[PDB]
């Protein structure tokens, strides 16, 4: 049953170059060509070239040309791409995609579509570096109140917030991350809760960040 | 024309790729065909044969495969030609329940494929084979033979077992391209059908049946 | 070969019929014209390809038609698992094109923002640094618009914002926007405002606190 598997993510500097990988498995006939295709964070999809296994003759686009090189390697039946002198845009999830004949009627035969799972490649200058993690303070009686935590210049993504170890997920908001000028990323959680609550019930944000080994216990407490 | 009495109802709903086959052939993957092939016996291991010859579940790349005698099947079930062997290979097309050829590629639900076979030198062929709709062989004729013998080991002889039972001849027993438990009768689509005979020798060879002689190319291993 | 999808956006409700229009600038054959359903943070999982054939395992409420320039993909009946973004995509001439998407979303009954405003943390400060949060929960619909203003100055490139997924629950969204200071700028003001617009709000809706009270 066709799979196509691709290699994991990658963080590379600007300058730099990234080999993404994308192994055929499962087929009983070998498809014979393989496209690349990048979506960037909250992009459309864009097509980037072809390789064709048979001729290993491959066609692009103009916007890499120098930059983007595809090979294939029969023996273990894995396409490369290889992007060449990175530049921050160039961060996208890049996807190996093959045409395959899914069926047949009145003498002609149609191609679907195989997708791999993606490789998310992120290009920057920073290095790894775990957050800093500041109380959003409580500011009612009968009436809601909303606390959090904001998770601030971290590298790279991503930070898991729980509150008070899981036992706090309804009404809990975790906003996408934002990528600062700094090239740091910050982020915040917030919880709505009821304001009778405020100086009894224990709010604790517990942030992660695997990267770095960071790990968090945050009291959230009303400011005096 | 000719070519619009296939039935060409394909669908590759399992993802197998197997429709590549039909166009731009020379990307079978082997690997697992010593496991698939492991399954097939060597004539030695079944037990010997003696008395009258009587007429008779899956693998039908084994050349042991006991089929059951070709009837009449419906088109929407088939991908690609169908070929029968008397033992040479000929092309069977669509038709409807009556018989008449029709030429719209096996899209009525009418259209059939009437395989009913008999022995030459009195009937038409031995046994036919093809894919059906998802790219699985199919295979039928005969019957094959009950050629005696005690044991679990028992043989249905499908093709020439001579050395099983000196009467069990391809003539008597064949039912469909294995003309011996080494050699299958070779064909354009031998390769789609039995994709695991790939590497086979290919021998020119002689078969007498009636007294017509075939002169035919086989695929020996 | 452009494809340009209509709408940009469609609130519907479960159940209802949604129907997304692609059109091409030149002519693509029914041959080539696919369709995609792409949910937040995974892989375009592909519905419909030759225009109008169902990849195996979609649903049946999936269907595809249309020819030539102009092409249309209907569920006939939405289900909760629905509400995606999707695409079209032209694969007839090896280099690719694809539409910039259709988001199909939850339609609900106007909800106004609740507002709360957070002053940057005493530990944060020492830092050297002032994040000043604004927290506008739950409303729909998503468009909504966040202004900071500091002693009544409106602020403008020191903020960033993000936005939650429309909410499995109740079909709302939430919004987060960070007002950014050095130390020394934020300590030379004393009123920091969000001041908040929403359709669900007859007039603007502001929230501040004064520095050091
Ligand atoms: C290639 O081959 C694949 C594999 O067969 C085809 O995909 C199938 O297409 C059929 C027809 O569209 C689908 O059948 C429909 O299934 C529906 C429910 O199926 C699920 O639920 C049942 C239990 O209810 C399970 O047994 C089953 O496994 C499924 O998970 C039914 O609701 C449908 O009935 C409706 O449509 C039919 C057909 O018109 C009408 O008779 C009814 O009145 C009713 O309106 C229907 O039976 C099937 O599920 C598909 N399977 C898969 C895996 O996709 C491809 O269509 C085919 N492609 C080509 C190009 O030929
Ligand atoms: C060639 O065929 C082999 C055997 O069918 C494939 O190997 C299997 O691949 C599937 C899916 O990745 C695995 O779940 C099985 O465990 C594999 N079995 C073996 C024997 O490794 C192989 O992927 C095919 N090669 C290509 C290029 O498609
Ligand atoms: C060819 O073989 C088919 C069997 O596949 C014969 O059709 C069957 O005939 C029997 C006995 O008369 C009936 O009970 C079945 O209902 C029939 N089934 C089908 C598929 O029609 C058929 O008679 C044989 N000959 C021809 C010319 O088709
Ligand atoms: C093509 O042939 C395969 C193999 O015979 C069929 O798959 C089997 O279908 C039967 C129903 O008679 C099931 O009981 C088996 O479990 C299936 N086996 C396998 C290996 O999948 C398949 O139905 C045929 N396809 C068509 C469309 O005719
Ligand atoms: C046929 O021979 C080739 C030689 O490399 C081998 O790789 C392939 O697996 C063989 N196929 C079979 C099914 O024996
Ligand atoms: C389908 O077959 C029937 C029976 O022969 C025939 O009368 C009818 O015209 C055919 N329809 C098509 C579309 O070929």
Same mark, same amino acid.
């Given at each position: ?29 070998? /498809? ?88 998310? %490649? ?16 409580? /500011?009612? /009686? ?47 959680? %917030? ?34 | ?16 790729? !197997? ?8 990307? !079978? ?106 790219? !699985? ?85 | 070969?452009?494809? +340009? ?31 995609? &359903?792409?949910?937040?943070? &995974? ?12 990849? +195996? ?31 079209? @995509? ?87 926007? +960070?007002? +950014? ?7 030379? @003001? ?24």
């Amino acid at each position: 049953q066709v799979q196509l598997v691709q290699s994991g993510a990658e963080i590379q500097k600007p300058g730099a170059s990234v080999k993404v990988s994308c192994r055929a498995s499962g087929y009983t006939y070998i /498809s014979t060509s393989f496209h690349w295709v990048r979506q960037a964070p909250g992009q459309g999809l864009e097509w980037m070239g072809v390789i064709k296994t048979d001729d290993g003759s491959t066609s692009d686009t103009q916007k890499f040309q120098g930059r983007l090189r595809m090979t294939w390697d029969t023996s273990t039946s894995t396409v490369y791409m290889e992007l060449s002198s990175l530049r921050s845009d160039d961060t996208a999830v890049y996807y190996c995609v093959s045409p395959r004949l899914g069926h047949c009627r009145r003498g002609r035969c149609y191609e679907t579509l195989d997708w791999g799972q993606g490789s998310l %490649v992120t290009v920057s200058s920073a290095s790894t570096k775990g957050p800093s993690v500041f109380p959003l303070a409580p /500011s009612t /009686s009968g009436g809601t109140a909303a606390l959090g935590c904001l998770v601030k210049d971290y590298f790279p993504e991503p930070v898991t917030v729980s509150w008070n170890s899981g036992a706090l997920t309804s009404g809990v908001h975790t906003f996408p991350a934002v990528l600062q000028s700094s090239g740091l990323y910050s982020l915040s959680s %917030v919880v709505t809760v009821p304001s009778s609550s405020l100086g009894t019930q224990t709010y604790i944000c517990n942030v992660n960040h695997k990267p770095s080994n960071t790990k968090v216990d945050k009291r959230v407490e009303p400011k005096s | 024309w000719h070519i619009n009495r296939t039935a060409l109802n394909c669908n590759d709903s399992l993802h197998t790729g !197997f429709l590549a086959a039909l166009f731009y052939t020379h990307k !079978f993957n082997a690997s697992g065909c010593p496991e698939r092939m492991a399954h097939c016996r060597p004539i030695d291991e079944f037990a010997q044969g003696w008395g009258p010859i009587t007429y008779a579940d899956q693998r039908p790349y084994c050349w042991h495969y006991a089929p059951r005698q070709c009837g009449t099947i419906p088109a929407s079930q088939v991908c690609g030609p169908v070929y029968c062997f008397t033992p040479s290979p000929v092309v069977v097309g669509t038709t409807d329940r009556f018989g008449a050829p029709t030429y719209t590629w096996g899209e009525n639900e009418t259209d059939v494929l009437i395989l009913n076979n008999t022995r030459p030198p009195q009937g038409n062929w031995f046994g036919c084979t093809w894919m059906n709709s998802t790219g !699985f062989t199919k295979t039928c004729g005969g019957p094959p033979c009950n050629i005696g013998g005690v044991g679990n080991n028992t043989l249905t002889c499908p093709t020439d077992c001579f050395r099983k039972h000196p009467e069990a001849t391809y003539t008597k027993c064949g039912s469909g391209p294995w003309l011996t438990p080494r050699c299958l009768v070779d064909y354009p689509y031998r390769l789609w059908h039995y994709p695991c005979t790939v590497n086979f020798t290919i021998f020119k060879v002689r078969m007498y049946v009636g007294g017509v002689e075939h002169r035919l190319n086989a695929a020996c291993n | 070969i452009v494809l +340009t999808q209509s709408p940009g956006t469609l609130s519907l409700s479960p159940g209802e019929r949604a129907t997304l229009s692609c059109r091409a600038s030149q002519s693509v054959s029914s041959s080539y014209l696919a369709w995609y &359903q792409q949910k937040p943070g &995974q892989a375009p999982r592909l519905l419909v390809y030759g225009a109008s054939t169902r990849a +195996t395992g979609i649903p049946d409420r999936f269907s595809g038609s249309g020819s030539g320039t102009d092409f249309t993909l209907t569920i006939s009946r939405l289900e909760p698992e629905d509400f995606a973004v999707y695409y079209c @995509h032209q694969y007839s001439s090896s280099f690719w094109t694809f539409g910039q998407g259709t988001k199909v979303e939850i339609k609900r009954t106007v909800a106004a923002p609740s507002v709360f405003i957070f002053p940057p943390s005493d530990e944060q400060l020492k830092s050297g640094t002032a994040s000043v949060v604004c927290l506008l929960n739950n409303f729909y619909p998503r468009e909504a618009k966040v202004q900071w203003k500091v002693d009544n100055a409106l602020q403008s490139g020191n903020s960033q914002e993000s936005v939650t997924e429309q909410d499995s629950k109740d079909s709302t969204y939430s919004l987060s926007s +960070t007002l +950014t200071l050095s130390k020394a700028d934020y300590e030379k @003001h004393k009123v920091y405002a969000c001041e908040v617009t929403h359709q669900g709000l007859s007039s603007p809706v502001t929230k501040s606190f004064n520095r050091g009270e």
